[PDB]
From Swiss-Prot, chain A:
Highest taxon listed in the record's lineage: Eukaryota
Annotated TM spans: none
Function summary: Cytoplasmic dynein 1 acts as a motor for the intracellular retrograde motility of vesicles and organelles along microtubules. Dynein has ATPase activity; the force-producing power stroke is thought to occur on release of ADP. Plays a role in mitotic spindle assembly and metaphase plate congression.
Disease note: Charcot-Marie-Tooth disease, axonal, type 2O: An axonal form of Charcot-Marie-Tooth disease, a disorder of the peripheral nervous system, characterized by progressive weakness and atrophy, initially of the peroneal muscles and later of the distal muscles of the arms. Charcot-Marie-Tooth disease is classified in two main groups on the basis of electrophysiologic properties and histopathology: primary peripheral demyelinating neuropathies (designated CMT1 when they are dominantly inherited) and primary peripheral axonal neuropathies (CMT2).
Subunit organization: Homodimer. The cytoplasmic dynein 1 complex consists of two catalytic heavy chains (HCs) and a number of non-catalytic subunits presented by intermediate chains (ICs), light intermediate chains (LICs) and light chains (LCs); the composition seems to vary in respect to the IC, LIC and LC composition. The heavy chain homodimer serves as a scaffold for the probable homodimeric assembly of the respective non-catalytic subunits. The ICs and LICs bind directly to the HC dimer and dynein LCs assemble on the IC dimer. Interacts with DYNC1LI1; DYNC1LI1 and DYNC1LI2 bind mutually exclusive to DYNC1H1.
Protein name from the UniProt record: Cytoplasmic dynein 1 heavy chain 1
Lineage: Eukaryota, Metazoa, Chordata, Craniata, Vertebrata
Location in or out of the cell: Cytoplasm, Cytoskeleton
Record comment regarding domains: Dynein heavy chains probably consist of an N-terminal stem (which binds cargo and interacts with other dynein components), and the head or motor domain. The motor contains six tandemly-linked AAA domains in the head, which form a ring. A stalk-like structure (formed by two of the coiled coil domains) protrudes between AAA 4 and AAA 5 and terminates in a microtubule-binding site. A seventh domain may also contribute to this ring; it is not clear whether the N-terminus or the C-terminus forms this extra domain.
Whole-protein coverage range: 969 to 1114 of 4646
Family, per entry: Belongs to the dynein heavy chain family.
From Swiss-Prot, chain B:
Family named by the database record: Belongs to the dynein light intermediate chain family.
GO cellular component: centrosome; cytoplasmic dynein complex; cytosol; dynein complex; kinetochore; late endosome; membrane; microtubule
A GO term, aspect molecular function: identical protein binding
Subunit relationships: Homodimer. The cytoplasmic dynein 1 complex consists of two catalytic heavy chains (HCs) and a number of non-catalytic subunits presented by intermediate chains (ICs), light intermediate chains (LICs) and light chains (LCs); the composition seems to vary in respect to the IC, LIC and LC composition. The heavy chain homodimer serves as a scaffold for the probable homodimeric assembly of the respective non-catalytic subunits. The ICs and LICs bind directly to the HC dimer and the LCs assemble on the IC dimer. Interacts with DYNC1H1; DYNC1LI1 and DYNC1LI2 bind mutually exclusive to DYNC1H.
Protein name: Cytoplasmic dynein 1 light intermediate chain 2
Annotated binding of ATP, by residue: 32-39
Subcellular location: Cytoplasm, Cytoskeleton
Purpose: Acts as one of several non-catalytic accessory components of the cytoplasmic dynein 1 complex that are thought to be involved in linking dynein to cargos and to adapter proteins that regulate dynein function. Cytoplasmic dynein 1 acts as a motor for the intracellular retrograde motility of vesicles and organelles along microtubules. May play a role in binding dynein to membranous organelles or chromosomes.
Lineage top rank: taxon: Eukaryota
Lineage of origin: Eukaryota, Metazoa, Chordata, Craniata, Vertebrata
Positions of region (Disordered): 158-177
Keywords: ATP-binding, Cytoplasm, Cytoskeleton, Dynein, Methylation, Microtubule, Motor protein, Nucleotide-binding, Phosphoprotein, Transport
């Protein structure tokens, strides 16, 4: 049981619409304060070509960048919790029958109650949802539920 | 609840009996200055050339695919800027649980070698107020430092027979305590060691080759910088890599040292000394007598010159 694309790519994707949504503003060019001269048509940085110091000129402090990034870490934490809901159940594909069967022995009520548990847990694993969304962010898990 | 706790103990023990993965949740910090190809080589360690270069807390991931058990984790990348107004983004980078899951990388720019040590002790001071503010309990913090003293003394430089299989820096003769590298302790040695794997990377060491001819330096210029670097990295327990960003000098060496320091793997290369913009300085290898070995090579200079004046900063 595995997630593709993983949690690092999910965080990377949220940081990609960070990057596109911040280079709405940052990839705007800034204007040379004289233009018809020669010396600023010599080599410039991104802080001399583009308006990228307006991110350094946040007037209320940097506070909404940590608010957005904490929203990213909270969303990554919640989808990380739901992907390690279903990564808990890789134990059935790690399952060796000897660790069950030498533990149970021949006491029949353990086998009967275990068949009750596999029926009850298969009742839980046949539920209606195949895709879980937090905010916009979607897990696909329907194929692995089947 | 006999069979339920029995079966829950079975599901705890069965996933223990499976194949081990690299433990995820690892973070990698980039300290240092902008304009140095932090994003560039950090994408090279990801597997790319250049990424979507933002600013502040840039994120990537390193594709750490295992070659032994053939698994793949990806560890977190937090490229911090040169700005100290957006330096407050590091609480999403590293916490105290994942502070042992952290390989700290410092950028030294060798395109701007004159601004190195003030940025080093400034970002190290940032890291010190950071490491005071993140509030580790001090018994585990001193446990990390005492075991870092332990693995610091465990190190050997690799031989030709240690460029394959892992060099046994633990017990070769089993169940004992013997010295491997015994450091002469000074005030440049481990006095603000933090108990974590720390690294400083010299970036753009092909821009030294500008200043070997367009500034016309000598051999004792790099030993001045390098002895100051040895004094400060040995004070925090670190290694030192001399890299060119643009020519991409020995990326696999870097990746082997990253997986070697994070998950206890092997870094399969000896400490290079032979090319002056590619001198490898490990952790637990160099000491203050080795700093004085550069002073044997000090023929025309004494080490008490100024940092921007001996290593000539142009006023722009």
């Amino acid at each position: 049981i595995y997630l593709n694309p993983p949690i690092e790519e999910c965080r990377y994707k949220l940081y990609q619409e960070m990057f596109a949504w911040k280079m709405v503003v940052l990839s705007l060019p800034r204007i040379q304060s004289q233009r018809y001269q020669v010396g600023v048509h010599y080599e410039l940085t991104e802080e001399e070509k583009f308006y990228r110091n307006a991110l350094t000129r946040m007037p209320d402090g940097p506070v909404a960048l940590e608010e957005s990034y904490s929203a990213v870490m909270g969303i990554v934490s919640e989808v990380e919790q739901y992907v390690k809901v279903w990564l808990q159940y890789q134990c059935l594909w790690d399952m060796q029958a000897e660790n069950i069967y030498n533990r149970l022995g021949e006491d029949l009520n353990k086998w009967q109650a275990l068949l009750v548990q596999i029926r009850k847990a298969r009742g839980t694993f046949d539920n209606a949802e195949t895709k879980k969304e937090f905010g916009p962010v979607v897990i696909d898990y329907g194929k692995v539920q089947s | 609840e006999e069979g339920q706790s029995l079966w829950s103990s079975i599901l705890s023990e069965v996933s223990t009996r499976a194949r081990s993965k690299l433990p995820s949740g690892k973070n990698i910090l980039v300290f240092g200055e902008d304009g140095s190809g932090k994003t560039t080589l950090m994408t090279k360690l990801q597997g790319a050339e250049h990424g979507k270069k933002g600013r502040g807390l840039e994120y990537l991931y390193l594709s750490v695919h295992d070659e032994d058990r053939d698994d793949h984790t990806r560890c977190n990348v937090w490229i911090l800027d040169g700005d100290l107004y957006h330096k407050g983004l590091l609480k999403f980078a590293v916490s105290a649980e994942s502070l042992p899951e952290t390989l700290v990388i410092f950028v030294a720019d060798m395109s701007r070698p004159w601004t190195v040590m003030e940025s080093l002790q400034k970002w190290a001071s940032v890291l010190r107020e950071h490491i005071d503010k993140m509030k580790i309990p001090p018994e585990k913090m001193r446990e990390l430092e005492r075991k870092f003293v332990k693995d610091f003394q465990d190190y050997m430089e690799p031989e030709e027979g240690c460029q394959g299989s892992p060099q046994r820096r633990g017990p070769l003769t089993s169940g004992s305590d013997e010295e491997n590298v015994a450091l002469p302790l000074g005030d440049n040695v481990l006095t603000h060691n933090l108990g974590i794997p720390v690294l400083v990377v010299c970036t753009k060491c092909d821009a030294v080759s500008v200043l070997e001819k367009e500034h016309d330096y000598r051999d004792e210029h790099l030993d001045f910088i390098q002895s100051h670097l040895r004094r400060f990295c040995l004070q925090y327990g670190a290694a030192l890599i001399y890299t060119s960003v643009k020519e991409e000098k020995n990326l696999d060496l870097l990746y082997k040292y990253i997986v070697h320091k994070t998950y206890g793997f092997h870094f399969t290369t000896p400490a290079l000394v032979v090319e002056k913009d590619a001198v490898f300085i490990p952790a637990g290898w160099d000491n203050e007598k080795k700093i004085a070995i550069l002073h044997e090579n000090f023929t025309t200079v004494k080490p008490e010159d100024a940092y921007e004046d001996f290593i000539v900063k142009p006023p722009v």
